[model samples]
Target: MNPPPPETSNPNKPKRQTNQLQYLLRVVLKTLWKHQFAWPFQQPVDAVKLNLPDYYKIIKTPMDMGTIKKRLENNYYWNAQECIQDFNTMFTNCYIYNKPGDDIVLMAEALEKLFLQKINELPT
Candidate 1:
């Protein structure tokens, strides 16, 4: 009897790695949420409340931490790069909408630094 042709491949291999990645992403996200600088980025910006009539026009794709969390929970991210792109978009939007010296921009910069540092600390 041939031993099932040596049983080399598994169809679910990629899915198992993806699940591990999802868990790591969740860890990183929870850290960001607990940060003090996370308040402004916790939710989508209110254009009307802030009186920024041109917000949507200027920022075509507005991203926020809350939205990222939802997408992660829904398994919308295929890999870590997609999640990182959303973070970059969120910070870029803040930079474009506010002055460099503004508090919101500063907070975004701080959080971005933290994120970069933490991401690097992930296991290889």
Candidate 2:
């Protein structure tokens, strides 16, 4: 009888690593959502209600925690970097729409710093 085929790399290894990354991302997102400064970023900006006619024009790619969470749940990110990019985009939009020292902008800056710090703790 023929010997068993040579052993191959663990087929489940890559999938396991991906699951780990997804779990870590979810943990980071949960922390961000729980932050006190997360209020403004919890949902998409309401340009009409806020009377910001040029908001969309200035911020071409709007992002928010709610949208990010949805995407995460749907497996939208291929890696941690993609998730990080969305977070950056969300804060960048805030900076573009509001004055430098505005309360909302300040909150966004604080939350962004927190996000960076948290992601730094993640594995490479």
Encode model 1's per-residue lDDT on 19-123: one tens digit a residue: 435754577788889999999888777777667778877887788888777766656665777678888999999999888899988899999998887777655
Off by over 4 Å in 1: 1-20
Residue 11 accuracy (lDDT) in model 1: 46
Model 1: pairs clashing at backbone N, Cα or C within 3 Å: none
TM value for model 2? 0.78
Candidate 1, backbone clash total? 0
Q: Candidate 2, residues 10-123: lDDT per residue as tens digits?
A: 344332236535754568888889988998787777777667777777887888888777766656656777668888989988888778999998899899888878787675
The candidate scoring highest on TM-score is 1
RMSDs, each prediction? Answer: 13.0, 13.4
**TM-score (C-alpha, index-matched) for candidate 1:** 0.79
Candidate 1 CA-lDDT value: 0.74
